[PDB]
Design a protein around this ligand. Sequence first.
Ligand code: CA
Ligand code: CA
Length: 122
Amino acid sequence: DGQAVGEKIFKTAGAVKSYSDAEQLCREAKGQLASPRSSAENEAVTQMVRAQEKNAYLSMNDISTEGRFTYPTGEILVYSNWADGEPNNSDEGQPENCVEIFPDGKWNDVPCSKQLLVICEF
Ligand SMILES: [Ca+2]
Ligand SMILES: [Ca+2]
């Protein structure tokens, strides 16, 4: 089941995990973390966040080069939807290398230790 755009399918079982535990769960299922590359893909992920009532991880991170957000291929973003003033690399001054998506579809950079909804893509 889940939500689809073109050949891409998004699914969740309601699991709530850290970034590294979320990545392991999606890879064990033979997929990867949600990686919305267009407005239409972003809207499909956002509908699932609203249904589950919990912010979700996206795949993308800046662990390599600070301020350059990349996919699991290591390629640069082809699409973004940052909330006003994001990304700011500031959890009360502390580093924020991972990305959460809100129920309004906007994005915020977070610490990779945060516990969030797990949404996978296939
Ligand atoms: Ca950062
Ligand atoms: Ca932030």
